[PDB]
Amino acid sequence: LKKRIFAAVSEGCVEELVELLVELQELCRRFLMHKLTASDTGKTCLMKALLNINPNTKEIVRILLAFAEENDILGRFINAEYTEEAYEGQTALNIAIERRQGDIAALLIAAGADVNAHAKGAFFNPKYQHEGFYFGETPLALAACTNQPEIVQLLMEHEQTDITSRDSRGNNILHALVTVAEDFKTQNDFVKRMYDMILLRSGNWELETTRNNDGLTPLQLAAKMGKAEILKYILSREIKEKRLRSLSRKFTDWAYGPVSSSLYDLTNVDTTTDNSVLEITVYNTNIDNRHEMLTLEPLHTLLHMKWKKFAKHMFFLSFCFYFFYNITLTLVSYYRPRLQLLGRMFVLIWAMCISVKEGIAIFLLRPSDLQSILSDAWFHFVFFIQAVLVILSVFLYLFAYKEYLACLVLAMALGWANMLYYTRGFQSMGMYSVMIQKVILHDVLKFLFVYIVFLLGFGVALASLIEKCPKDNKDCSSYGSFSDAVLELFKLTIGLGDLNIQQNSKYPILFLFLLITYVILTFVLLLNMLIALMGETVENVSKESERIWRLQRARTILEFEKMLPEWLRSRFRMGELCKVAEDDFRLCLRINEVKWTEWKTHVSFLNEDPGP
Amino acid sequence: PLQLAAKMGKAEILKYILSREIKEKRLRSLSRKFTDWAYGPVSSSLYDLTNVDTTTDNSVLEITVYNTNIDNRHEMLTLEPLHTLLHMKWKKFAKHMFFLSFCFYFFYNITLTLVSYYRPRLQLLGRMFVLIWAMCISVKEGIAIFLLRPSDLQSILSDAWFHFVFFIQAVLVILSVFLYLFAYKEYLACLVLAMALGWANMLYYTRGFQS
Amino acid sequence: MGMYSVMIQKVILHDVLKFLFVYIVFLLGFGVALASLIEKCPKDNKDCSSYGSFSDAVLELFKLTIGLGDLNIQQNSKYPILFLFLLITYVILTFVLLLNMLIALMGETVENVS
Amino acid sequence: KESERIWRLQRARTILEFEKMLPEWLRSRFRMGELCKVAEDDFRLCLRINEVKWTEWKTHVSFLNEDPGP
Ligand SMILES: CC(C)=CCC/C(C)=C\C=O
Ligand SMILES: CC(C)=CCC/C(C)=C\C=O
C-alpha cells in the first residue's frame, strides 16, 4: 500500500527508495498525489524524511528535490502543513532546523522554503510551561530557542527573514526568547547570547518596543515572568560599538580608576507610565523569583531613593497619625463616664476615612494575592474589620442597643494589634515582625488542630467519666459539662488549676489515668512545636526573614506613590538629556561603583571629565 | 533479576533496568523504556510496566513497597515507572477511597462521642452505628492483624502499631457494649477509653495532606 | 565564665527588648480592654472583679503570663465570654511571642558561633 | 529526609493497601497501550512519561511514533 514510502524513508535505503520513486510518477500517468500524504496528519515524503534523521539522508533529500522539481510539485510539497489537533503549519523547515541539521536546512532555504511559516498549533501553544513546547511559531525563533546560532545567522541574512514578524500569540523573537529562559542551572546562558545577537543584528528600536497582545514588551515580559537573568542583562546592557550604542541602556558617564558613574536609562523602568518595569516586578505575586530580581541596580537604587525622598515622610506621618488615633480610642472608653469631648469625633471621622480608603481598596485586587501567604492582603482584612467594628459599635451605642462595650472593646483589642504592622519602617523590628506572621500561618495552626482534637476527645471522656451529681452539691466535680472539662484541661495545660484526685467520680483512678496521659500527650505535642520550627527556619535562614520584608517595603513605597496627586509627582529622575542618542531621551539615573579587581582602559565614557 | 533487585534494595540496577533503552536493531526488544517521540526539550517515553504494575502476584511495585527488611526503599521508590505509577493511582482511586474512609470514620467517631455524653443517666439509631462498625473493624482488622511477617514489628514504623491501636479500640467498644448489656456496669470504664483512643486515631488519617 | 558572660549583655541589648516592646504593646492594648470590659461595681464589693483599674488588669495579665494567678470565668462582668475570649487570645498571642524569642536566637547565634 | 521520605513510603503503602480492598470488576483502571507493535511478541502494557531538558542537545532517531501527539 502507501505505507511502503513511510517504511522506506525511515530506514535510509536510498537505493530501495529510488527503485520505486522512478515508477510512482508513471503510476498515476501524471496532481495532488495522495500517496505521499496522510488523512490523519497530513505528512509529505520530504517532510517525513527529516523526522527520522538516518546517517544516509542527504541523498534522500537530494533525490526528493529532484522528484519535486521534475513533477512541478513544490508548492504543496516543500510548504505543507498538518490538519489535525495541536499541529498546524509545521513545514519542512520547521523540522530540519529542529533536528540540529544545518546542511539540509540551508538546502531547503536555497530552494525558497517558507522561512516565515507560522506553526500555530495547540502543542506549540501550551496552557502552561510544562505540557508543551512553545518556541515562537516560526522557523527563526525555533533555532534561537535551541542552541543553534549558525542557522540563526544564515536565516537572518536572508532577504525574506522578516525578523520583526509577530507570532499569532502577539509575541516576537525577543518575546519568545524571554519566555523560554527558564533558569541558568538547567539552561545555561545561551538564551541571553542569542538575545544579544538578534538584537544587534536588528539594529533598531522596534523589537524591544513592540507591544505584545497582552500589552507588554520583552522588558516587561521578562519582569512579569521572573526572568531575572534577561532582566539583569537588559537593564545593564552597555554597547561600546558605534551605530549600535543607541540600543544600550546603561551608559558609563565617566570612570576614574575604581570609581565610575553609570547613567542607567529608566525611560520605561520608572513608575511614570502604566505597567512599568518596577510596578510589574513588585505587583506580581504569581512569581517567586521576585526575591533576587528586585536587587538589580535600576530597581534597588530607585526604591532606596524613593524611600529616602517621600516614602519616609509618608510612613512616619501615617504611623504617628494612627498612633494618635489609637491612643485617642483608648482614652475615650476607659476614661468614659459610666472640654475633652473632641475625642469622640477623632475616632469617628477617621473610622469613616479608613472605611473609604480601605473600603475601596479591599476588593480592587487580583485573587492571586490571596493565593500566597504574605501579599499585604490579610492586613487589609484586619484594618477593615477594625474600622467596621468601630463604626458598628458607635451606631449601636447611639440609636438602640447597649453593646457599646462588646464590639468596641475589640476595637482597641485589634487596634493595638495593628501597631505591630507599622514596624516595617525599622530594619531590625521589621526583621523581627515577619516570622510573627509566618509561624502563625505555618506552624501554630498545625499544633492548634491536634490540640483541639485532643481537647475534644478528652473533654467528652472526662465529662462523662464523672458521677452525675444528684444536686446535693451544686458545683459538683468541677467537670460537670463538656465546656467545663475543656476549660479545666486547657487550664491544666498552661499550669494553672488543680490536679486533685478526688473529683467525685465512680472511677477516680481512670480519671487520673486520663489526666496523666493527657499531660504526657500535650507535652509531646508541645515538643513537636520546636521540632517543626527546626524543620523550617534552619534551611532558609537570612532568606525568608528580610528578603520578603524588603518586598513588603518596596510594595509600601509603590503604594505611597498612588496616594499622592499629580502636582506632587515633581520628584522624577534627572538628566532630560537628548544628547546620548539622536532621539528625545527621557530620563536617566546615576549610579556609582568602586571595583579594585578589574583593570582596563576605558574609552566609552559619556562625559569626558568626571564630576556630578 | 528485576524482582530480585527490587527486594534486595539494588536501586542502581533497578534504575538501569526500568530505564533500559536500546536503540540498536535486533536488540531493541530487550529494552524497557521506549521513547515515543521527541521535539526538542519535551519527549515522551513509553515505559514497559509489563511486570512492574500490580497486576500479578509479587510485582516490582508490590515488592519494592512491601519489604521492610531493606532501608534502601528511601531512594528506590523514586524511579519513574514507580513514582508516576503511585501518583496516578493516588489521583485515580486512592484519593476517593481515603477521603471516604476518613469521613466515614469521622462520622463513626462523632456518633460514638454523642452516644455516651448525651446518653441518659428518635435518635436511637446512634447505638447501632457504633456496634455494626465495631464488628466490621473487628473483622477486617481482626484478619489483617496477624497476616503479616514478623519483620514488620522489627522496624519502628511499618503500619503495624496502628493495627494494634485500631484493634484495641474496636475490642474495647465491643467488650464495653457486651459488659453493658448482660451483667456488668463498667459501661463507663472501658468505653470512656473508646473515644479517648478513637479521637486519637483521627491523627492517623492526616497522611492525605502533605503538610 | 567570661565566655558565658558576654551574650548575657548581647541578648538583652539585641533580642529581649524586641519582645519587650511587643509585649508592652500587647499588655497596654489588652489592659485597657479588660479593665473597661468589667462591670463597674457599685461598691457593694470593695475589691470588685480584681481588674478594677488599668494597672490592676496589667498586673493580672503579667501574672497570668508567668503562670501564677487565676483564670476564673466569673469575674463580675457584663460579658463573661468576651472576657474569656480576650484572655484566651492573649495567652495564645503571648505564646507565639515567646516562641519567636527562641526564633530570633536562632537567627543571630547560629551564624557567628565561636 | 526522615520526615517526608518515610511519609511517602506510608502513602505508597496506603495506595497499595487500597488496591486489595476492591474487587476484580473494579480493576478496570489498568495502564494504556496494549500495543503488540513495539515488538513481535504480544506486548501487554505501557506507560507514557514526559520530560523537558534544556541542556542535552542531540539528534534523536530512535523514537517510536514518527510525529508527536498524545
Ligand atoms: C502579624 C503582625 C506583625 C501584626 C498583626 C497582629 C494580629 C493583628 C494578629 C497576629 O497574628
Ligand atoms: C502517632 C499518631 C500521629 C497518632 C496516634 C496517637 C496515639 C494513638 C498515641 C500517640 O502516640
Curated annotation (Swiss-Prot), chain A:
Effect of residue 420 to A: Impairs channel activation by tetrahydrocannabivarin
Effect of residue 430 to S: In OLMS1; gain of function mutation; results in constitutive channel activation
ANK repeats: 1-30, 44-72, 88-117, 135-165, 172-204, 214-236, 272-294
Regions that enter the bilayer but do not cross it: 478-503
Compartments, record wording: Cell membrane; Cytoplasm; Lysosome
Effect seen on changing residue 418 to A: Impairs channel activation by tetrahydrocannabivarin
Assembly and binders: Homotetramer. May convert from a homotetramer to a homopentamer to allow pore dilation. Interacts with TRPV1; may form a heteromeric channel with TRPV1. Interacts with SNX11; this interaction promotes TRPV3 trafficking from the cell membrane to lysosome for degradation.
Disease tied to this protein: Olmsted syndrome 1: An autosomal dominant, rare congenital disorder characterized by bilateral mutilating palmoplantar keratoderma and periorificial keratotic plaques with severe itching at all lesions. Diffuse alopecia, constriction of digits, and onychodystrophy have also been reported. Infections and squamous cell carcinomas can arise on the keratotic areas. The digital constriction may progress to autoamputation of fingers and toes.
Protein name from the UniProt record: Transient receptor potential cation channel subfamily V member 3
This protein's encoding gene: TRPV3
Residue span relative to the full protein: 119 to 755 of 790
Swiss-Prot record, chain B:
Described purpose of this protein according to its UniProt entry: Non-selective calcium permeant cation channel. It is activated by innocuous (warm) temperatures and shows an increased response at noxious temperatures greater than 39 degrees Celsius. Activation exhibits an outward rectification. The channel pore can dilate to provide permeability to larger cations. May associate with TRPV1 and may modulate its activity. Is a negative regulator of hair growth and cycling: TRPV3-coupled signaling suppresses keratinocyte proliferation in hair follicles and induces apoptosis and premature hair follicle regression (catagen).
GO cellular component terms, A-Z: cilium; cytoplasm; lysosome; plasma membrane; receptor complex
Main location class: membrane
Protein name per UniProt: Transient receptor potential cation channel subfamily V member 3
Disease implicated: Olmsted syndrome 1: An autosomal dominant, rare congenital disorder characterized by bilateral mutilating palmoplantar keratoderma and periorificial keratotic plaques with severe itching at all lesions. Diffuse alopecia, constriction of digits, and onychodystrophy have also been reported. Infections and squamous cell carcinomas can arise on the keratotic areas. The digital constriction may progress to autoamputation of fingers and toes.
Localization of this protein: Cell membrane; Cytoplasm; Lysosome
Complex and partners: Homotetramer. May convert from a homotetramer to a homopentamer to allow pore dilation. Interacts with TRPV1; may form a heteromeric channel with TRPV1. Interacts with SNX11; this interaction promotes TRPV3 trafficking from the cell membrane to lysosome for degradation.
Organism per entry: Homo sapiens
Signal peptide (residue range): none
One Gene Ontology MF term: calcium channel activity
Species lineage: Eukaryota, Metazoa, Chordata, Craniata, Vertebrata
Reported tissue expression: Abundantly expressed in CNS. Widely expressed at low levels. Detected in dorsal root ganglion (at protein level). Expressed in the keratinocyte layers of the outer root sheath and, to lesser extent, to the matrix of the hair follicles (at protein level).
One of the protein's GO biological processes: osmosensory signaling pathway
Regions of this protein lying in the Cytoplasmic compartment: 149-159, 207-209
Keywords: ANK repeat, Calcium, Calcium channel, Calcium transport, Cell membrane, Cytoplasm, Disease variant, Ion channel, Ion transport, Lysosome, Membrane, Metal-binding, Palmoplantar keratoderma, Repeat, Sodium, Transmembrane, Transmembrane helix, Transport
Placement of ANK repeats on the sequence: 1-19, 55-77
